[PDB]
Amino acid sequence: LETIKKQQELAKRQVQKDMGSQKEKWEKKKLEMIETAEASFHENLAKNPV
Amino acid sequence: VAKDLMEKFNNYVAQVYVLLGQIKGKTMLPLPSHKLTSKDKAHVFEGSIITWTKQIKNVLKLEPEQLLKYGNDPGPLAEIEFWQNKRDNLNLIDSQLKSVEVQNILHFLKSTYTTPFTKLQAEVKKARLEANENYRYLFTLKDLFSKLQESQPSDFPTLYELFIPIMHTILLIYNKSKTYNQPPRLVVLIREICNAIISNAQAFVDKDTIFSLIDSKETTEACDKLQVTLDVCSKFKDAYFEYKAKAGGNWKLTSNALFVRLDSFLERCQDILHLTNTIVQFNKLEKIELGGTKGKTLTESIAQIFKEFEEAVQAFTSVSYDIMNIAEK
Interface test with A, best of B134, B141, B169, B220 (most A CBs within 10 A): B169
Could you say which residues from 143 to 172 on chain B have a Cβ atom under 8 Å away from some Cβ of chain A? 161-162, 164-166, 168-169, 172
A49 CA: distance to closest CA in chain B (Å): 8
CA B200, B205, B209, B211 torsion: positive or negative? Answer: negative
Looking at residue A21, the DSSP 8-state letter turns out to be S
Could you say which residues from 24 to 43 on chain A have a Cβ atom under 8 Å away from some Cβ of chain B? 27, 30-31, 34-35, 37-39, 41-42
The answer to whether the CB atoms of B168 and A27 lie below 8 A apart is no
Give the residue from chain B lying closest to A32, CA to CA.
B165
Spatial CB neighbours of B119, under 8 Å, sequence gap ≥ 6 = B54, B58
Q: CA–CA separation, B138 vs A29, rounded Å?
A: 28
Q: Report resolution (Å) to 1 decimal.
A: 4.0
Q: CA–CA separation, B15 vs B49, rounded Å?
A: 10
The answer to whether the CB atoms of A35 and B164 lie below 8 A apart is yes
Question: Is the distance from CB of B306 to CB of B289 less than 8 angstroms?
Answer: no
A12 CA: distance to closest CA in chain B (Å): 18
The answer to whether the CB atoms of A45 and B139 lie below 8 A apart is yes
Question: Is the distance from CB of B133 to CB of B182 less than 8 angstroms?
Answer: yes
CA nearest to B171, candidates B233, B239, B237, B234: B239
Q: CA–CA separation, B149 vs B74, rounded Å?
A: 11
CA nearest to B262, candidates B233, B288, B291, B226: B233
- Minimal Cβ distance to A31: which of B164, B172, B176: B164
Residues in chain B with CB shorter than 8 Å from the CB of A46 are 176
Spatial CB neighbours of B93, under 8 Å, sequence gap ≥ 6 = B27, B29, B30
Q: CA–CA separation, B74 vs B59, rounded Å?
A: 22
Question: Is the distance from CB of B75 to CB of B140 less than 8 angstroms?
Answer: no
B165 CA: distance to closest CA in chain A (Å): 4
Burial A32-49 (b: 16+ CB within 10 A, else e): eebbeebeeebeebeeee
Residues in chain B with CB shorter than 8 Å from the CB of A37 are 165
Tell whether A45 is within 8 A of chain B (Cβ): yes
- Minimal Cβ distance to A38: which of B138, B169, B176: B169
Residues in chain B with CB shorter than 8 Å from the CB of A38 are 165-166, 168-169
Question: Is the distance from CB of B123 to CB of B56 less than 8 angstroms?
Answer: no
* Count of C-beta atoms within a 10 Å radius of residue B144: 22
The answer to whether the CB atoms of A34 and B162 lie below 8 A apart is yes
A45 SS3 class: helix
Q: CA–CA separation, B198 vs B208, rounded Å?
A: 18
The answer to whether the CB atoms of A41 and B166 lie below 8 A apart is no
Residues in chain A with CB shorter than 8 Å from the CB of B168 are 35, 38-39
Looking at residue A1, the DSSP 8-state letter turns out to be -
Write the Ramachandran bin of B155: left for phi over 0, alpha for psi from -120 to 50, otherwise beta: left
